[PDB]
């Protein structure tokens, strides 16, 4: 049986004061009857208004990135600043940061370990590109990603870790992942965790699907054996995120 | 003589809610008798708090970085988000972003042009490393950096632009810039702007000193013909920043 599901909203680099206020108001008025942890990952600029306006008992707030420590890093936000700011969840290693902003397997791993050490809950992202998948390298690429993370964690740290699998290979390329393709990837990840870190860790670990999800396909995805929720992109800026939440029943 | 001076506080990746609150209170309580534009560049997280609490009429708020466009750039903040948030000043091209976060001369130039196009006042940072200076390339590097920015600007855009010269060769290297070395760098920049953009633009341009300062040497630095103020790092998290403001009278 599954651990507690998670419905995470990755707003990415998006939003206005008005549009996210209206979104938060919808979230606040939504009845959620089952046990699910909901997460809103806003831009740094919008954390203050999200802290103030978001009140639903099943929602927490997350950052989309950080660096490990404060100092002479103009433009960046550190873990201690987020902690001082009351933000205790964080998304790390997003495919966009791996692609655009120099985050190697090892850089992601150090950020994840630093965030767990500071007391964060971490949604750590992995996932293979279209070249990697077609070339038959899905397993080695995705499991190398998570192994790099695992090499920097104690067994106890996995209690604070959530995995989001991003099927980068489908996004923007014109592909759409089937629930069986998603389940195949999640089962591969969980089997590696079971073998290399422990069956007990693997049974408790939440693995979120991070491809394109809507209110329709989310229920069918969550029915799969190794899907513990969603790390949602574009749909999390829209009212249908509510239906994605309800799909984790 | 000189155009209006600027005293900018680059807080870099630093600050708690309490410690920055106490700093803003000090700024709010400071009497500033001369014409100077003071600027507070906080982390993205602290922008809301600074907007609410900063009240001194000679102060504005700035961001430390941005990307040009909203979209699928997890972890980043865009210029439309900052503009929507009421932030109208921005530091771009800081040496730490050029070193750590992939910002080439061209990437800095594109960010500066996008910010100028969006209405921002921009503090665009240039300056050479110790290795560049020691190999005799101070002038080549500084002029290459500003030429790349100028390439993406029209003459009228310079009204929105401020240049900050960072003696990166003196940033934790063991070296210390003298006022004569700063002035030579500032004069070189002025000379290029006058010859390539216009003598009118050059006379109106603010070229800020972005190396280490205290009250005493800031007063000496402001005596130099081509220094129009300061883009301060570590002193700007301290009460001493008020003495740097005073050094521009």
Curated annotation (Swiss-Prot), chains A, B:
Classification via PROSITE patterns: TIM_1 (PS00171), TIM_2 (PS51440)
SUPFAM superfamilies in the record: Triosephosphate isomerase (TIM)
Pathway per the UniProt entry: Carbohydrate biosynthesis; gluconeogenesis; Carbohydrate degradation; glycolysis; D-glyceraldehyde 3-phosphate from glycerone phosphate: step 1/1
Isomerase in keyword set: yes
The keyword Isomerase is assigned to this record: yes
Annotated S-S bridges: none
Catalytic activity from the UniProt record: D-glyceraldehyde 3-phosphate = dihydroxyacetone phosphate
Active site: 94, 166
Subunit (UniProt): Homodimer.
Miscellaneous note of the record: The enzyme contains a high proportion of positively-charged residues in beta-barrels V and VII (compared to the homologous regions in other triose isomerase sequences). Since 2 clusters of positive charges located at precise distances on the molecular surface are common to 4 glycosomal enzymes, it has been speculated that this might represent a signal for entry into glycosomes.
Record-given protein name: Triosephosphate isomerase, glycosomal
Source organism per UniProt: Trypanosoma brucei brucei
């Amino acid at each position: 049986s599954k651990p507690q599901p998670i419905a995470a909203a990755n707003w990415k680099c998006n939003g206005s004061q008005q549009s996210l206020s209206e979104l938060i108001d919808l979230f606040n008025s939504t009845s959620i009857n089952h046990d699910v942890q909901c997460v809103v990952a806003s831009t740094f600029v919008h954390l203050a208004m999200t802290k103030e306006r978001l009140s639903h008992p099943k929602f927490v707030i997350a950052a989309q990135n950080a660096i490990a420590k404060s100092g002479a890093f103009t433009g960046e936000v550190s873990l201690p600043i987020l902690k001082d700011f009351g933000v205790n969840w964080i998304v790390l290693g997003h495919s966009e940061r791996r692609a655009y902003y120099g985050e190697t397997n090892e850089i992601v791993a150090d950020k994840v370990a630093a965030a767990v050490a500071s007391g964060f809950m971490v949604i750590a992202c992995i996932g293979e590109t279209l070249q990697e998948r077609e070339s038959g390298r899905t397993a080695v690429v995705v499991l190398t990603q998570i192994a790099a993370i695992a090499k920097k964690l104690k067994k106890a740290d996995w209690a604070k870790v959530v995995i989001a699998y991003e099927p980068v290979w489908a996004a923007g390329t014109g592909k759409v992942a089937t629930p069986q393709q998603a389940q195949e990837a999640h089962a591969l990840i969980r089997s590696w965790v079971s073998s290399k870190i422990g069956a007990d860790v693997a049974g408790e670990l939440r693995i979120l699907y991070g491809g394109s999800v809507n209110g329709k396909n989310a229920r069918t995805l969550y029915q799969q054996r190794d899907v513990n929720g969603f790390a949602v992109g574009g749909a999390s800026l829209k009212p249908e995120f509510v239906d994605i939440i309800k799909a984790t029943q």
